[PDB]
Design a protein around this ligand. Structure first.
Ligand SMILES: O=C(COP(=O)(O)O)[C@H](O)[C@@H](O)C(O)COP(=O)(O)O
Ligand SMILES: O=C(COP(=O)(O)O)[C@H](O)[C@@H](O)C(O)COP(=O)(O)O
Lengths: 261, 261
């Protein structure tokens, strides 16, 4: 039975994403162009190309942000009611974007100028993946919460493979969160034992009894840029080598596969 | 003008690749199924989806192996004579597969059995990315030659971007070589100064005067599995963040892009 996959999908275009402004918590909608964009994406992957087979989708995880949720609706439009009824949708707060704090709605170069004026970054340039954001999340905070979601997804994958089913699980989220998610999925960054109060607690970030909570002994986080590109409405694919959930791997073809004979 | 890209393409199916046998120097052809498969891939990326625009392809680099070259022919079949005339094709020996030496045409598990019988791998399992192959290439050796090709390609990218043109450069090669190639492209592994006689010399691995040779001061190589999947006839995409050749990045969407408005 087909190796399980995690399909990452970045929210479609917003007014801020279009112009490079850091959109974290701000609950922006898709632009009219972004709606069209995500509609076309859904048609490409389901109808025109069959890069995804609905019969194989088991779970869709989404950030609680409007633009992620809108992206789920538009991308899944090509499905029949029957196909939809068999797919479970779960809103997971662990998949929200990096909390930018003071940097919300700013540009990269504005962030650099703001920090320089606070007297930081004297020895080396700011690097979100190492430093986090003043009044927002550190890298260990985002790494921790994405690890918990990854553990939940990989646990469903293992449960499904052992029930003899295919399992594509979709994750709709954001540009930083998803690059980060992909990075640790396949082993980037460092391993950190769960020890502090923050690191151990059940957070209760989603509400859906069919998704077992997995309590982490340890987690991964980044200390440097993993150097990924993922555009607004871009799609990436995470899976496993040799049908083995213990060998998570990055699919270099993203969602592309050669057309069947 | 569009950020330059390197489009990696793995040779289509062979009799050995279908069955997991390590195909290095052995000059196998595509199976009949593999031909069909690469023909359909070409139509998907140029005609049915336009994931690739021929007007933007400047160079195609290919391993000297028959199966890679055959893959070039079939994937580019949808192009007109006019489009082909403007694209330069370069055979580059630096893009050959990992030299397997003793392991040629063997299965992973056979290689493990063979090594265990020579009394190796007592402390930890064989890991090609660290250990290389008896009578074949070390990881340094492959990392060095792939680094030279990367430098040549990125130098053409920089020359083109500074001439104001788009540049998609395709690289047709092999499963280990391309995963390795992708891993170091975006900064995995370690930096090693060029110092030994091997590391410094001009090897003359291609013959095309329009490709400036770049003499490396230093190179990258892996010391561990980068955990990528890339199937036979799989397509990946390497590029740069912020239109900057000094920021090479992995495209998580491989060749997928949402259909234009
Ligand atoms: O804030 C966004 C994420 O949220 P969504 O737009 O996905 O909601 C993006 O990740 C970009 O604004 C961004 O900073 C890209 O930074 P880069 O790494 O290119 O220097
Ligand atoms: O020899 C091949 C490359 O040659 P082409 O078939 O691409 O020429 C492949 O790289 C396979 O042999 C292979 O071992 C996959 O290893 P894995 O990582 O799955 O454990």
């Amino acid at each position: 039975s087909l190796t399980p996959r995690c399909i990452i999908v970045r929210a479609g275009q917003t007014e801020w994403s279009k112009s490079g402004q850091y959109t974290g918590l701000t609950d922006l909608p898709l632009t009219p162009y972004g709606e069209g964009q995500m509609l076309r994406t859904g048609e490409s992957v389901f109808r025109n190309n069959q890069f995804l087979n609905p019969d194989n989708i088991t779970y869709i995880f989404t950030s609680p942000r409007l633009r992620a949720r809108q992206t789920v609706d538009l991308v899944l439009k090509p499905l029949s009611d029957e196909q939809r009824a068999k797919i479970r949708v779960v809103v997971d707060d662990d998949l929200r974007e990096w909390e930018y704090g003071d940097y919300e709605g700013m540009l990269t170069r504005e962030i650099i100028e703001l920090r320089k004026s606070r007297g930081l970054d004297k020895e080396r340039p700011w690097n979100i993946w190492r430093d986090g954001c003043e009044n927002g999340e550190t890298t260990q905070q985002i790494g921790l919460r994405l690890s918990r979601a990854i553990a939940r997804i990989q646990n469903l994958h293992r449960k499904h493979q052992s029930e003899g089913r295919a399992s594509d699980i979709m994750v709709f989220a954001h540009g930083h969160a998803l690059r980060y998610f992909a990075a640790i999925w396949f082993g980037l960054g460092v391993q950190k034992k769960c020890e502090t109060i923050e690191e151990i607690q059940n957070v209760k970030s989603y509400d859906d009894d069919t998704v077992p909570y997995v309590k982490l002994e340890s987690y991964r986080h980044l200390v440097d840029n993993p150097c990924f590109l993922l555009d607004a409405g871009g799609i990436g694919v995470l899976s496993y080598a040799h049908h083995n959930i213990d060998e998570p791997a990055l699919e270099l073809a993203g969602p592309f596969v050669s057309p069947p004979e």
